[PDB]
PDB file of C-alpha atoms in Angstrom:
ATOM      1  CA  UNK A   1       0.000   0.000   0.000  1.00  0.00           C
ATOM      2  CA  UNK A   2       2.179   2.521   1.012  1.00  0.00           C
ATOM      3  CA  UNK A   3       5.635   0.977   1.363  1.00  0.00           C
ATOM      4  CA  UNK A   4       9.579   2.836   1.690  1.00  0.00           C
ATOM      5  CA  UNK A   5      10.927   4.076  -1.437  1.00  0.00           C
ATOM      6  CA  UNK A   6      12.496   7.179  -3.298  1.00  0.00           C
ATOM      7  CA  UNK A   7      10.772   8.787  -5.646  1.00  0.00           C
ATOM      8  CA  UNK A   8       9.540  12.372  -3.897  1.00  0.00           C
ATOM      9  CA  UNK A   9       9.638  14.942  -6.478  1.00  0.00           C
ATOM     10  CA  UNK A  10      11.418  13.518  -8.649  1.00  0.00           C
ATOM     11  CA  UNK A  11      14.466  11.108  -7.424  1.00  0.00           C
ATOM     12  CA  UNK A  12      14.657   8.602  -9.738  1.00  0.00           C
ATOM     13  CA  UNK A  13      17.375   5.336  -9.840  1.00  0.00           C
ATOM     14  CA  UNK A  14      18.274   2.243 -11.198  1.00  0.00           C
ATOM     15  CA  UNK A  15      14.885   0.827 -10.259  1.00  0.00           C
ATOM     16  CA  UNK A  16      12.939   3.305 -12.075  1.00  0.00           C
ATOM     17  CA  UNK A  17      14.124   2.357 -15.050  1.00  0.00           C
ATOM     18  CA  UNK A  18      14.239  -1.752 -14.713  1.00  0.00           C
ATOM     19  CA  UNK A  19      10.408  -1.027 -13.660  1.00  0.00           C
ATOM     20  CA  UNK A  20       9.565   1.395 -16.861  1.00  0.00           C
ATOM     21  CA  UNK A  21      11.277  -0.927 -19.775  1.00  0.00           C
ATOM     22  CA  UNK A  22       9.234  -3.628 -18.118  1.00  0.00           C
ATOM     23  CA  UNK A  23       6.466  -0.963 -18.024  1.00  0.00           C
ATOM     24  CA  UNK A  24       5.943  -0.377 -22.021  1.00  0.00           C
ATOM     25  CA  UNK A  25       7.469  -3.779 -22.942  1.00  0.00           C
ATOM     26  CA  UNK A  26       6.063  -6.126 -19.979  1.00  0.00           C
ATOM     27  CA  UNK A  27       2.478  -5.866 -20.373  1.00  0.00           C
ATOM     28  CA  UNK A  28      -0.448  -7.590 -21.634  1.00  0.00           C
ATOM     29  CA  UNK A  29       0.361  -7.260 -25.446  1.00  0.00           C
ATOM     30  CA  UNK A  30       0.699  -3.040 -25.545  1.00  0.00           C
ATOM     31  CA  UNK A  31       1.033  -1.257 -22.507  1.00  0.00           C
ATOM     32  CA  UNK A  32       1.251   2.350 -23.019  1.00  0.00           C
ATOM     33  CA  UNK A  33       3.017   5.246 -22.399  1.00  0.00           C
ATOM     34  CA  UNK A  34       0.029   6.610 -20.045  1.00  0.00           C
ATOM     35  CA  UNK A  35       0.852   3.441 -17.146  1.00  0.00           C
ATOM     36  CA  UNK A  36       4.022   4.683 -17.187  1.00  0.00           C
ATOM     37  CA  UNK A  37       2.568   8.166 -16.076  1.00  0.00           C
ATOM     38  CA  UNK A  38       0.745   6.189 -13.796  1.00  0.00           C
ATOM     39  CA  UNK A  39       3.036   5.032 -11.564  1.00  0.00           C
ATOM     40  CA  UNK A  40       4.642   8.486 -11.887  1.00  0.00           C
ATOM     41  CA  UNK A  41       1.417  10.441 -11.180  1.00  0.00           C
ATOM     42  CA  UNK A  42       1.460   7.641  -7.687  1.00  0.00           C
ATOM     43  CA  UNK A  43       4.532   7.804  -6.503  1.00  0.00           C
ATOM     44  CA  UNK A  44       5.058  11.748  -6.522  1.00  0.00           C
ATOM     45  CA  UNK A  45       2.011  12.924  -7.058  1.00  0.00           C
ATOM     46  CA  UNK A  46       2.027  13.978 -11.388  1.00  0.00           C
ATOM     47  CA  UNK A  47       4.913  15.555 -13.292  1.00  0.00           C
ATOM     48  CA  UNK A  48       5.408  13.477 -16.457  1.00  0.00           C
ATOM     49  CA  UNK A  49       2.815  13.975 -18.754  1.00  0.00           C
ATOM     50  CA  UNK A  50       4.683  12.160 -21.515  1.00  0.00           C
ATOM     51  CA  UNK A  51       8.160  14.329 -21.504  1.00  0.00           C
ATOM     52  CA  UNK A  52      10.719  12.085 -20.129  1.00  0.00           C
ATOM     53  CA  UNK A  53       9.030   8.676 -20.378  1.00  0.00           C
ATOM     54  CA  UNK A  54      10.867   8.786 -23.376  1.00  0.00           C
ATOM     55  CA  UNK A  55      14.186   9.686 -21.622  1.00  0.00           C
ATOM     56  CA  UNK A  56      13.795   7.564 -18.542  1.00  0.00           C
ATOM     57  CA  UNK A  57      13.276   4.756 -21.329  1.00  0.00           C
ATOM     58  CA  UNK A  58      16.388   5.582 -22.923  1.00  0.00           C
ATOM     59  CA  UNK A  59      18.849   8.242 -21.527  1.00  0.00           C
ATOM     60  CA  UNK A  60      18.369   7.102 -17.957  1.00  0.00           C
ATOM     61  CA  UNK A  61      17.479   3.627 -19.882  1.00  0.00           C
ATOM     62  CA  UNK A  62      21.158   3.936 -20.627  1.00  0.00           C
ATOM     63  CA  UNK A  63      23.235   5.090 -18.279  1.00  0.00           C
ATOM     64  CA  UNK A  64      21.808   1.906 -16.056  1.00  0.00           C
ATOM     65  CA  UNK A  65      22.370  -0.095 -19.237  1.00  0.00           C
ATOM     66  CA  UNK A  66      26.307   0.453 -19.218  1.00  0.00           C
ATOM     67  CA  UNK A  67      26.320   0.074 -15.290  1.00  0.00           C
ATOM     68  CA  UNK A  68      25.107  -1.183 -11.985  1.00  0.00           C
ATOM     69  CA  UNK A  69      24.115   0.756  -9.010  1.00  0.00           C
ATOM     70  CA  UNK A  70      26.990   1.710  -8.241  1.00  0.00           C
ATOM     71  CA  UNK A  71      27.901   4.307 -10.539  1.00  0.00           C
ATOM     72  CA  UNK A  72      26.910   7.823  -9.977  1.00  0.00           C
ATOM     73  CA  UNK A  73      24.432   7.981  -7.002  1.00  0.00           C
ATOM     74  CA  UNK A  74      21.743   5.470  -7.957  1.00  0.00           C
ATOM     75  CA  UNK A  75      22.130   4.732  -4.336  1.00  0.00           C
ATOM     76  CA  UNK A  76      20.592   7.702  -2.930  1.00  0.00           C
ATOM     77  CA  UNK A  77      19.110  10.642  -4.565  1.00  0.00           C
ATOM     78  CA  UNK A  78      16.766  14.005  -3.284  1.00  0.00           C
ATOM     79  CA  UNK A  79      19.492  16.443  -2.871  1.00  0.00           C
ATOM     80  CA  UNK A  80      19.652  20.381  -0.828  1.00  0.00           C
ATOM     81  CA  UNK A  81      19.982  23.237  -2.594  1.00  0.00           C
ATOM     82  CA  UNK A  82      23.995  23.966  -1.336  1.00  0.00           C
ATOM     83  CA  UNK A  83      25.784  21.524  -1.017  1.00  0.00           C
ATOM     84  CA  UNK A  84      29.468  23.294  -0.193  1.00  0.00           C
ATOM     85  CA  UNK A  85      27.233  25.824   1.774  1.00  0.00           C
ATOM     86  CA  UNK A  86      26.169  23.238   4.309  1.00  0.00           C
ATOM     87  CA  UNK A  87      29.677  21.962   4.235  1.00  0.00           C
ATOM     88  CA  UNK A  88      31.323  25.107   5.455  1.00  0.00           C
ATOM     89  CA  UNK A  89      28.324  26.442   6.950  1.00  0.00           C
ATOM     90  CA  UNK A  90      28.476  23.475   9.446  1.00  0.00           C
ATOM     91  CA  UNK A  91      31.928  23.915  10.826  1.00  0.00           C
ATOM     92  CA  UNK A  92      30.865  27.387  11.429  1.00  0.00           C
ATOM     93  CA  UNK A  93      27.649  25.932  13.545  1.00  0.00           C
ATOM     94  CA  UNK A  94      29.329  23.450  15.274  1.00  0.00           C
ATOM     95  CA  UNK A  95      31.504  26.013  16.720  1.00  0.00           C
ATOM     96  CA  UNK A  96      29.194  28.450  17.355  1.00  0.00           C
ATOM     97  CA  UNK A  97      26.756  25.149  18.995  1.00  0.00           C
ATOM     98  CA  UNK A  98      26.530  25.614  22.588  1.00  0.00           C
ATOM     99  CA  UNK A  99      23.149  25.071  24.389  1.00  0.00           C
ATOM    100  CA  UNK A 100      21.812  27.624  21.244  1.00  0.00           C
ATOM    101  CA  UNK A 101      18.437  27.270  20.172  1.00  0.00           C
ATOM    102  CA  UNK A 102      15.741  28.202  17.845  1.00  0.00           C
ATOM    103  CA  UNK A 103      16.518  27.345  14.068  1.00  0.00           C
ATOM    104  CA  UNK A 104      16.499  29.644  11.190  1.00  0.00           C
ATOM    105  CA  UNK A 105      17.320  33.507  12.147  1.00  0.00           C
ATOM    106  CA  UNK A 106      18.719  32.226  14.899  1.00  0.00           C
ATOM    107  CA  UNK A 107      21.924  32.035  11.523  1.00  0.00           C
ATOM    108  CA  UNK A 108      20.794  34.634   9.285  1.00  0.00           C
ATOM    109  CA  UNK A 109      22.128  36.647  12.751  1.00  0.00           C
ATOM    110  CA  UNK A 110      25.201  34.865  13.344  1.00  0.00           C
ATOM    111  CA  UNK A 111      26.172  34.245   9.593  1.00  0.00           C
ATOM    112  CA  UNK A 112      25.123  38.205   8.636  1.00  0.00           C
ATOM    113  CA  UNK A 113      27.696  38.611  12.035  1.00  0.00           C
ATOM    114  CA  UNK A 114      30.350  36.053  10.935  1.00  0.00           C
ATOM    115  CA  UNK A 115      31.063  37.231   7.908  1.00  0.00           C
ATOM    116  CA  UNK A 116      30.937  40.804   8.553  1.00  0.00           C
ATOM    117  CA  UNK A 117      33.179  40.819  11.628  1.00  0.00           C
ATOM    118  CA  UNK A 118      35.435  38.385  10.606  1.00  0.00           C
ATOM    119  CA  UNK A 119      36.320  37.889   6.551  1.00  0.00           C
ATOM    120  CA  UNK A 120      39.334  36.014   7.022  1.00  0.00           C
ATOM    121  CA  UNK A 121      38.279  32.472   8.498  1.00  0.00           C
ATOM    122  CA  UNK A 122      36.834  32.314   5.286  1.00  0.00           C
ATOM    123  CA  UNK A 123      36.594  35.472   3.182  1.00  0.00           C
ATOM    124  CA  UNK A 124      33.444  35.245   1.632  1.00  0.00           C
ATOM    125  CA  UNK A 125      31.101  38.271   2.191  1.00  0.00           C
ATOM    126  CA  UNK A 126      27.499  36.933   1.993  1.00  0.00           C
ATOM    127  CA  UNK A 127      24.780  38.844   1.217  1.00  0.00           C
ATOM    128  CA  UNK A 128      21.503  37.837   2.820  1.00  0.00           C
ATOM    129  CA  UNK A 129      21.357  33.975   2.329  1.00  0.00           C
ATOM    130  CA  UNK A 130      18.942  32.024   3.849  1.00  0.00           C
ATOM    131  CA  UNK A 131      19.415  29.360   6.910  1.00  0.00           C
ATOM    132  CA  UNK A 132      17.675  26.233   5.449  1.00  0.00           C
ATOM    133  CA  UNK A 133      21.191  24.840   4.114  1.00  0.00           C
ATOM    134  CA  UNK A 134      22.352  25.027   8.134  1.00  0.00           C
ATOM    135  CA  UNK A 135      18.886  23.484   9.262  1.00  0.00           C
ATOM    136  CA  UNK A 136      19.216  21.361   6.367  1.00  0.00           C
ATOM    137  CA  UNK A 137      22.454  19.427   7.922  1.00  0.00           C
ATOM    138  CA  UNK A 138      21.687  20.530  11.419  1.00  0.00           C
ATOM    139  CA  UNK A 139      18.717  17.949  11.125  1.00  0.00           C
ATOM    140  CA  UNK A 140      20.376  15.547   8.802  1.00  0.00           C
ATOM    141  CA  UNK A 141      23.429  15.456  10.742  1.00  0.00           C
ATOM    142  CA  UNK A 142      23.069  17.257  13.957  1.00  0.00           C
ATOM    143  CA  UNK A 143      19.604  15.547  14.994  1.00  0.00           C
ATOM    144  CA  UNK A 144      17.181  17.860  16.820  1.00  0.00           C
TER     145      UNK A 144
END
């Protein structure tokens, strides 16, 4: 019924694609582009109304057809927005850690500070960037 996968959005793996060629070309006689949508439309809601059926069936069809799941990421998939932002915008957290509290602002004041006061631990003036990234590893890393 409801089950552990990827999907989400739009993830996508090695899985997706064994399950689409078997899609179009496993089915009673002719199976149709449209079931393909189908389990689209059900596993993240609808956001392939025929456009990349026809890539996951070969460009993705490919990729997984020269490799295992091992190559790239087929592993795991959904990725942040800023990735070398959480990076370095960790080290700065965990540092600045303590018994702190609140998520969110709680950055946008100490990273609009850090940078400001101090443009040598890293020397890159920001501009106004948001705190999700931090949250973003704070919670997948840092737990509550």
């Amino acid at each position: 019924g409801i089950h552990m996968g990827k999907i989400k959005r739009r993830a996508i793996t090695e899985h997706e694609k064994r399950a689409l060629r078997h899609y179009f070309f496993q089915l009673q006689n002719r199976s149709g582009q449209q079931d393909l949508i189908e389990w689209f439309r059900e596993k993240f809601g609808k956001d392939i109304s025929q456009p990349s059926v026809s890539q996951i069936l070969s460009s993705k069809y490919s990729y997984l057809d020269n490799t295992v799941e091992k190559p790239w990421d087929v592993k795991r998939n959904r990725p942040p927005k800023y990735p070398l932002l959480e990076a370095a915008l960790f080290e700065w957290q965990v540092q600045q850690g303590d018994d702190a509290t609140l998520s969110g602002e709680t950055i946008k004041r100490a990273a609009a500070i850090l940078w400001h006061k101090i443009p040598e631990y890293q020397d890159q003036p920001v501009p106004n960037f948001s705190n999700g990234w931090l949250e973003g590893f704070r919670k997948r890393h840092i737990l509550h």
